[PDB]
């Protein structure tokens, strides 16, 4: 989409490094629409980061491992409170259920900012 998203979306910002910690790829903004009620697990996330790499020169690369302390975070202005609120979800196998924040924001961005070790297919 050429315009801002109109619904919830996952925002992937990842730095790809090699097994030795040489950076190979800088964060590339890539968005994927997502719906509240969806369960996002570590494996789905690893696929989303792989899909994100296909929009770059490392399209033939696969994820070897994600920073295990990476989390999904969303920030928004709570209307009632006049406060900025932040919610963080850990990335585990069983995963978490995407909340519906439309009460405060129609198009929340769930951000994933992290490093991933990647390797050629």
Residues interacting with a copy of itself, by CB under 8 A? 18, 22-26, 35-37, 39, 56-58, 60-61, 87, 89, 96-100, 103, 120
Choice between 82 and 94, CB closer to a copy of itself = 94
- State both tokens at 49: 């980061």
> Which residue is it, tokens 């968005």?
31
Q: How far is the CB of 86 from a copy of itself (least distance, A)?
A: 13
Q: How far is the CB of 27 from a copy of itself (least distance, A)?
A: 9
What is the distance between the alpha carbons of residues 58 and 111, in angstroms, rounded to a whole number? 21
> Which residue is it, tokens 């992290």?
114
- State both tokens at 91: 């990335």
Residue 92: phi and psi, rounded to 5, are: -120, 170
Contact call for residues 33 and 106 (beta carbons, < 8 A) = no
Cα 75 from chain centroid (whole Å)? 13
Q: How far is the CB of 9 from a copy of itself (least distance, A)?
A: 15
Choice between 7 and 68, CB closer to a copy of itself = 7
Choice between 37 and 84, CB closer to a copy of itself = 37
Choice between 81 and 120, CB closer to a copy of itself = 120
Q: How far is the CB of 1 from a copy of itself (least distance, A)?
A: 20
């Amino acid at each position: 989409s050429y315009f801002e998203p109109t619904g919830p979306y996952l925002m992937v910002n990842v730095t790809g490094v090699d097994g030795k910690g040489n950076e190979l790829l800088s964060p590339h903004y890539v968005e994927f629409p997502i719906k509240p009620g969806t369960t996002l697990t570590k494996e789905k996330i690893e696929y989303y980061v792989e899909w994100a790499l296909d929009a770059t020169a490392y399209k033939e690369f696969r994820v070897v491992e994600l920073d295990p302390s990476a989390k999904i975070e969303v920030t928004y202005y709570d209307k009632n409170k006049k406060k900025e609120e932040t919610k963080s979800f850990p990335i585990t196998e069983k995963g978490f259920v995407v909340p519906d924040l439309s009460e405060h924001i129609k198009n929340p961005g769930f951000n994933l900012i992290t490093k991933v070790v990647i390797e050629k297919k």
